[PDB]
Amino acid sequence: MKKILVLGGAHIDRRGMIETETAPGASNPGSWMEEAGGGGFNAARNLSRLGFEVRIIAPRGGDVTGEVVAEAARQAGVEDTPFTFLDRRTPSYTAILERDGNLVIALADMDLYKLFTPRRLKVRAVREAIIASDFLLCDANLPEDTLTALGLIARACEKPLAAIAISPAKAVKLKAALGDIDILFMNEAEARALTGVRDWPNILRKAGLSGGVVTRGASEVVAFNGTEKAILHPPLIREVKDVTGAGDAMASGYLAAIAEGKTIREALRQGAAAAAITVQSSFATSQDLSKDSVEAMLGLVPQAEML
Interface positions with Na ion (CB under 5 A): 218, 242, 244
Instruction: In whole angstroms, give the CA distance from residue 247 to residue 35.
Output: 18
Task: Please report, as residue ranges, which positions from 25 to 84 form the binding site for Cl ion (by CB under 5 A).
Answer: 38-39
Q: Which is nearer to Cl ion, 68 or 197 (CB)?
A: 68
Q: Is 91 in the site for Cl ion (CB under 5 A)?
A: no
Q: DSSP letter at 129?
A: H
Closest CA to 174 of 196, 204, 143, 203: 143
Q: How many residues bind Cl ion (CB under 5 A)?
A: 3
- Looking at the DSSP bridge assignments, the partners of residue 97 are 17, 103
Residue 268: CB minimum distance to Na ion, A: 16
Choose from Ca ion, Na ion, Cl ion, none: what does 271 bind? Cβ within 5-8 Å by kind.
none
Choose from Ca ion, Cl ion, Na ion, none: what does 38 bind? Cβ within 5-8 Å by kind.
Cl ion
Residue 218: CB minimum distance to Na ion, A: 5
Q: Is 160 in the site for Cl ion (CB under 5 A)?
A: no
Q: Which is nearer to Ca ion, 149 or 232 (CB)?
A: 149
Q: Which is nearer to Na ion, 6 or 279 (CB)?
A: 279
Choose from Na ion, Cl ion, Ca ion, none: what does 179 bind? Cβ within 5-8 Å by kind.
Ca ion
Residue 63, class by beta-carbon neighbours within 10 Å (0-12 exposed, 13-18 middle, 19+ buried)?
middle
Residue 123: CB minimum distance to Cl ion, A: 24
Residue 183: CB minimum distance to Na ion, A: 20
Instruction: In whole angstroms, give the CA distance from residue 267 to residue 223.
Output: 8
Q: Is 9 in the site for Cl ion (CB under 5 A)?
A: yes
- Looking at the DSSP bridge assignments, the partners of residue 108 are 93
Q: DSSP letter at 91?
A: P
Q: Which is nearer to Cl ion, 91 or 302 (CB)?
A: 91
Site residues, Ca ion (CB under 5 A)? 176, 179
Choose from Na ion, Ca ion, Cl ion, none: what does 9 bind? Cβ within 5-8 Å by kind.
Cl ion
Which among 4-12, 117-125, 146-154, 198-206 is the span making contact with Cl ion, rule CB under 5 A? 4-12
Q: Which residues contact 289 (CB under 8 A, 6 or more apart)?
A: 46, 49, 50, 249, 252, 253, 274, 277, 278
Q: Which is nearer to Ca ion, 177 or 231 (CB)?
A: 177
CA distances in angstroms from 292 to 11, 49, 81, listed in the order given: 28, 10, 28
Residue 141: CB minimum distance to Cl ion, A: 5
Q: Do residues 289 and 277 make contact, with C-beta atoms less than 8 angstroms apart?
A: yes
Burial 3-38 (b: 16+ CB within 10 A, else e): ebbbbbbbbbbbbbbbeeeeeeeeebeeeeeeebbb
Which stretches of the chain bind Cl ion, using CB under 5 A? 9, 38-39
